[PDB]
């Protein structure tokens, strides 16, 4: 599923990313996921939901990428963020 995020300078995208730090059967489709999403925030507006797993950030594959590096990627694109997510629910 796709979400295009364009925010204003001083707001967030409105979500909490959570997942393994960089330091059998797949149960997660990716290492980082949305622990929560701000109701009526830029991220919730684009359709993102708690429990969405991050597959791509701004065209980059982040399935196996540690947390800080993914946050790094999400920030590089300033107020613009593109995400391919997968819902486990």
């Amino acid at each position: 599923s796709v979400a295009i995020l364009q925010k204003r300078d001083h707001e967030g995208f409105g979500f909490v990313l959570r997942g393994a730090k960089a330091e059998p059967t797949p149960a997660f489709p990716a290492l980082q996921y949305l622990e929560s999403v701000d109701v009526e925030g830029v991220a919730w507006k684009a359709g993102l939901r708690t429990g969405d797993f991050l597959i791509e950030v701004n065209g980059v594959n982040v399935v196996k990428v540690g947390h800080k590096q993914v946050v790094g990627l999400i920030r590089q694109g300033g107020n613009r963020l593109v995400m391919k997510v997968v819902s486990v629910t």
Binding site: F13, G14, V16, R18, A20, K21, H67, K68, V71
Partner: peptide
């Protein structure tokens, strides 16, 4: 595990 508000 880490969490980041974004």
């Amino acid at each position: 595990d880490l969490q980041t508000s974004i």
